[PDB]
Assembly symmetry: C7
Homo-oligomer: 29 residues x 7
């Protein structure tokens, strides 16, 4: 469904943010 | 659908945030 | 619809956050 | 509707976050 | 409804984040 | 319901984020 | 359901963010 697909896009974007957030954590260490 | 379209706008905004977040990670490195 | 309108409000708020996030990236760069 | 109202509260909280994020950007400049 | 109640929990958690975010802004100014 | 339960999981994850965010505010102080 | 599964993916992604956020807090102290 289009609604479920859009919700999965939201999750994918958040995993993108999490990847960057882990890079920042490594950067500070 | 209007609901699915709006949910896709939410994902698009989060991708904007992820792009800026990657820029911040690069700056710290 | 009211639900779609509220979801677009969520998207716009995230676009506000993205603007500020870019401002932080510029400040750090 | 109750669901639409709750979604608007999510949007309002995100606008609170955006305001604070702009304050952080000001601090960094 | 259970769905509306859960969405209000989401909004409240975001309001918690906003409070902490304001605390961070205050610290960076102070 | 499974949808309400999943929404509560989203809320719980955000409360985890808020906890860490408060720890960061304390760290800066 | 597909919608509930997708919402659970969102929740898990936020838990990924929470873990990374805790690592940042630790880094600022350690």
């Amino acid at each position: 469904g289009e609604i479920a697909k859009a919700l999965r896009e939201i999750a994918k974007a958040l995993r993108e943010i999490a990847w960057a957030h882990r890079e920042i954590a490594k950067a500070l260490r």
